[PDB]
Design an enzyme around this catalytic site. Structure first.
Site, PDB file in Angstrom:
ATOM      1  N   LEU A 213       0.764  -1.247   0.000  1.00  0.00           N
ATOM      2  CA  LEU A 213       0.000   0.000   0.000  1.00  0.00           C
ATOM      3  C   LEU A 213       0.795   1.297   0.000  1.00  0.00           C
ATOM      4  CD1 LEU A 213      -2.833  -0.568  -0.463  1.00  0.00           C
ATOM      5  CD2 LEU A 213      -3.434   0.282   1.813  1.00  0.00           C
ATOM      6  N   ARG A 214       1.373   1.669   1.137  1.00  0.00           N
ATOM      7  CA  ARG A 214       2.151   2.901   1.188  1.00  0.00           C
ATOM      8  C   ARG A 214       3.183   2.893   0.064  1.00  0.00           C
ATOM      9  NH1 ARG A 214       1.620   8.102   1.944  1.00  0.00           N
ATOM     10  NH2 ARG A 214       3.693   9.090   2.001  1.00  0.00           N
ATOM     11  N   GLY A 215       3.929   1.795  -0.043  1.00  0.00           N
ATOM     12  CA  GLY A 215       4.929   1.682  -1.093  1.00  0.00           C
ATOM     13  C   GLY A 215       4.284   1.598  -2.471  1.00  0.00           C
TER      14      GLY A 215
ATOM     15  N   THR B  31       2.489   4.944  -3.499  1.00  0.00           N
ATOM     16  CA  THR B  31       3.426   6.019  -3.829  1.00  0.00           C
ATOM     17  C   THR B  31       4.010   5.731  -5.209  1.00  0.00           C
ATOM     18  OG1 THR B  31       3.996   6.388  -1.499  1.00  0.00           O
ATOM     19  CG2 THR B  31       5.559   7.222  -3.156  1.00  0.00           C
TER      20      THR B  31
END
Length: 321
Positions: free
Chosen positions: A271-273, A276
Site C-alpha cells: 500500500l504505502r509503497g 506512492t
C-alpha cells in the site's frame, strides 16, 4: 527578487524530477534529499518555487488566504487587498522551538482578549508553498512527526492552551539528509514519499561549470534570467498541463500488477509503497503527456519511491524486465 533558475542547475536529475512530480501531485508526499554538505540542496526547491506562477493572497494574511472569506477567525488582518506573491519557501533551521514551528497562543494576552492572541509560526508561512529542512535527521522525532502529519493532512491544528486553533497548511515538505549523522528512525523515513540522492560532482570540470554559471548569474541576475526563463517557462507549462491531464491518465491493471509485483519482490511491501509508486508513475506519465501509466514510468520512479523504505535497481530490471 531574482532566483537562480531551475533549468540552469547542473545535473540533479532525480532531485529535479522529484520536485516536478510533487509539483504535479503533492499527494505523493514529502521529498527526502540525501547528500553531502555542499550539494546546495535547497537551490532546486527555491528555483522551482520561483518558476511557478505567483499566488494570489490577502496582503496582510499570515496564512496567505486566497481571499478575505478564508481568513482564519483568530487572525487579525488589516490589509485585506488581494495581491500576487511568490510561492513561499520556508526554511526550518536546526534548534527551532516547537512553538515557532507550529505557532503558539500568547496565554497572557489570550485571557485579555482570547483567540486573537495566537501567534502563527513557520507552518503558517509554508501554507501554499514549500517547507525545507536542511538537517532533517538532526531534528527531534516529535517535530518531524508533526511536520509529516501536517504535510499529509494539509491542516495545522493547535488544540493546546484551552483553544482549538487551526489554519490551512498545504505545502510540499522537503527534508535534507545531511552526510551522515546516523541514518535515523526508519519509522519516519517510510513516511516520506520520495527519496533522492544529490551528490556533489567530484570532477573539476563539472564543478567549474557550476561555479561559472552561478558567477555569471550574479554578475547580472536580470540578464541571466532573460536567457534561461524561456526554458523555465517550458518547465512551468509542463507542470501546469500535467496537472490538467493528471485526473485523466489511465492506470490499467497491468500497471497495478507491475506495481504489486515490484513491491512484493522487494522488502518495501505494499500500500504505502505500492500507492506512492503508482502515484509517482502516473504523475510522470502526466508530465510526459502519456495516456496511461506503463511499465517504464514505474521503472523510472521505482528507486525514488521505494529505496528509502527498505530494511532496488537490481530488483527492478529483474522483476520488471
Amino acid at each position: 527578487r531574482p532566483v537562480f533558475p531551475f533549468s540552469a542547475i547542473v545535473g540533479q536529475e532525480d532531485m529535479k524530477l522529484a520536485l516536478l512530480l510533487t509539483a504535479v501531485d503533492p499527494g505523493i508526499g514529502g521529498v527526502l534529499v540525501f547528500g553531502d554538505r555542499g550539494t546546495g540542496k535547497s537551490t532546486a526547491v527555491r528555483a522551482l518555487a520561483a518558476l511557478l506562477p505567483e499566488i494570489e493572497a490577502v496582503e496582510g494574511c499570515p496564512v496567505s488566504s486566497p481571499n478575505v472569506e478564508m481568513i482564519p477567525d483568530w487572525a487579525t488582518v488589516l490589509s485585506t487587498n488581494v495581491i500576487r506573491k511568490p510561492t513561499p519557501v520556508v526554511d526550518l533551521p536546526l534548534g527551532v522551538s516547537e512553538d515557532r514551528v507550529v505557532g503558539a497562543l500568547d496565554i497572557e494576552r489570550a485571557i485579555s482578549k482570547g483567540e486573537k492572541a495566537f501567534e502563527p509560526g513557520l507552518l503558517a508561512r509554508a501554507n501554499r508553498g514549500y517547507l525545507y529542512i536542511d538537517e532533517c535527521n538532526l531534528l527531534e522525532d516529535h517535530i518531524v512527526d508533526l511536520l509529516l502529519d501536517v504535510a499529509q493532512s494539509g491542516e495545522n491544528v493547535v488544540e493546546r492552551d484551552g483553544l482549538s486553533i487551526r489554519h490551512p497548511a498545504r505545502f510540499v515538505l522537503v527534508g535534507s539528509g545531511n552526510p551522515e549523522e546516523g541514518d535515523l528512525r526508519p519509522q519516519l523515513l517510510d513516511r516520506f514519499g520520495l527519496s533522492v540522492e544529490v551528490l556533489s560532482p567530484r570532477d573539476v570540470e563539472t564543478r567549474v561549470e557550476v561555479i561559472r554559471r552561478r558567477d555569471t548569474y550574479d554578475a547580472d541576475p536580470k540578464a541571466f534570467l532573460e536567457e534561461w526563463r524561456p526554458k523555465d517557462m517550458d518547465i512551468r507549462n509542463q507542470i501546469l498541463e500535467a496537472r490538467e491531464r493528471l485526473p485523466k491518465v489511465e492506470a490499467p491493471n497491468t500497471a497495478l500488477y507491475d506495481c504489486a509485483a515490484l513491491c512484493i519482490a522487494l522488502g518495501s511491501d505494499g500500500l504505502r509503497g505500492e500507492l506512492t509508486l503508482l502515484r509517482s508513475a502516473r504523475a510522470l506519465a502526466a508530465l510526459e503527456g502519456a495516456t496511461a501509466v506503463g511499465r517504464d514510468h514505474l521503472k523510472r520512479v521505482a528507486t525514488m519511491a521505494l529505496s528509502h523504505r527498505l530494511r532496488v535497481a537490481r530488483t527492478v530490471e529483474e522483476t520488471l524486465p
